[PDB]
Amino acid sequence: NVSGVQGFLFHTDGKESYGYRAFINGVEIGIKDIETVQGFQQIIPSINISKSDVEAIEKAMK
Amino acid sequence: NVSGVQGFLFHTDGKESYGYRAFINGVEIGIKDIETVQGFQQIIPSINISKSDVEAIEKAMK
Amino acid sequence: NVSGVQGFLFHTDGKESYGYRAFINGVEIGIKDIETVQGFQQIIPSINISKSDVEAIEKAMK
Amino acid sequence: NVSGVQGFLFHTDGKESYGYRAFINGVEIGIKDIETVQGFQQIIPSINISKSDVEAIEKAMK
Amino acid sequence: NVSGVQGFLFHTDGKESYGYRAFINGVEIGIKDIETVQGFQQIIPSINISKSDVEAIEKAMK
Amino acid sequence: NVSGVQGFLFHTDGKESYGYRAFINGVEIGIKDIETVQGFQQIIPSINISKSDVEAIEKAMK
Amino acid sequence: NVSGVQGFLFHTDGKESYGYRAFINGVEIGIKDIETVQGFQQIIPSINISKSDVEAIEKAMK
Amino acid sequence: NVSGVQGFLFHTDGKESYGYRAFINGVEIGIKDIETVQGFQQIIPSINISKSDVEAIEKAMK
């Protein structure tokens, strides 16, 4: 890993979308633009997380 | 490495399910939705642990 | 290693079986169910240790 | 590893360019010349970040 | 890496055996049973050390 | 990396050449001889940096 | 490296042999038996060092 | 990794030789004999550095 970035993008394909978010070096952020999603997808994984599970993930990525 | 996540998903296929759980960076969580299970299966392993063995694993992961 | 687990399963195929055990991040545990053995075999090695040698291994894995 | 540089180049292809920027060993810089962009592209990744998302990434990389 | 064990087995094939010994995470132990030798041979190397050379190796591994 | 050296050579192919320079374990040096450039090219990357960008790179490689 | 040993065997093929020696985790030792040389050759490199250079190497491996 | 040696050999092929030198675990040494040069070439890189550039490299490796 040469990027200096550890984390992942997350979104849900279920009923109540929250858009795309990411953990970037242990900091959670919202992503506003699809360009940015595509850019980060070059260096970090992009996974699915249900809206109901986001809270628990945040606890673990705290 | 790049995901910023070390850990694993665990469940039992035995007669009394406890659903899916995970250790994520040393923190134990419940996972509510199968979307989230499949998301995390892209970046961390997913193993079987019997209901009777969860206690010892929880203690070892302390 | 993405699991956050270092260690191994151990058992003997000799006269006085002690079932399966494991070292998980330097903590020794008994394993009650074969499901759990199979699960851990996905992420950590599974080796043979004679009953007579368990005591010495415990000293080294202390 | 061998370069002594962890980080990435970022730019947007959107309507209002901010040129190329980089995080180099946790320090954010502007890059003035495309020669330098192509030089750094030999050793670190180069991704797209929208203008609207730069703020959050800057905060996360703090 | 994943085993949580760094070290090696040692023995001599010379005229006076000292059996099998091991350094396991910096701790020297005797191994009593060949089952255990073969178990550990799945995860750590197994080398020859003459009886006359064991002393110096023990000191170096201090 | 077995060399004990992290860094890179840099030069520009643009108007105002500054010759070859390098960062070697976070220390910037001028290189006087092409032999030395060729030698370091065996163990560290060699990239292009415009004269106008050298100042900003020095800030990040400080 | 799973052995827990870093170093090398050394000998000279020149006029004034000093037998085989080794650095084992920064400790210099003489090796008395060829069996031991063969054993260590399974886990660490074996190189040539002239008798005249041993003193300088010892300084660096101190 | 396994050798316990990080560094490199250096020499010039220019008109005034300084022989072979090495940085071995951050310590600069002279090498007297070509046997030793070839021994170390099995485990660490060997590069060219002009006589005029040795000073700057020595300072950088401080």
Author numbering:
A (entry chain A), B (entry chain B), C (entry chain A), D (entry chain B), E (entry chain B), F (entry chain A), ...: 9 to 70
Paper text:
To explore the roles of cationic residues in PlyC, we mutated the exposed Arg and Lys residues on PlyCB to Glu in order to independently determine the role of each mutation in Spy binding and lysis, as well as PlyC cellular uptake. Moreover, the PlyCBK23E, PlyCBK59E, and PlyCBR66E mutants, but not PlyCBR66K, lost the ability to enter A549 epithelial cells (right). PlyCBK59E and PlyCBR66E that lack the ability to internalize in epithelial cells also lost the ability to bind PI and showed diminished binding to PA and PS. As expected, this mutant binds poorly to PS, comparable with WT PlyCB to PI-containing membranes (compare Figure 5d and Figure 5a).
One such Spy-specific endolysin, PlyC, has been characterized using biochemical and structural techniques and shown to be a 114 kDa multimeric holoenzyme. Nonetheless, our results suggest a moonlighting role based on structural motifs within the PlyCB subunit whereby a cationic binding groove is a central determinant of interaction with plasma membranes and subsequent internalization.
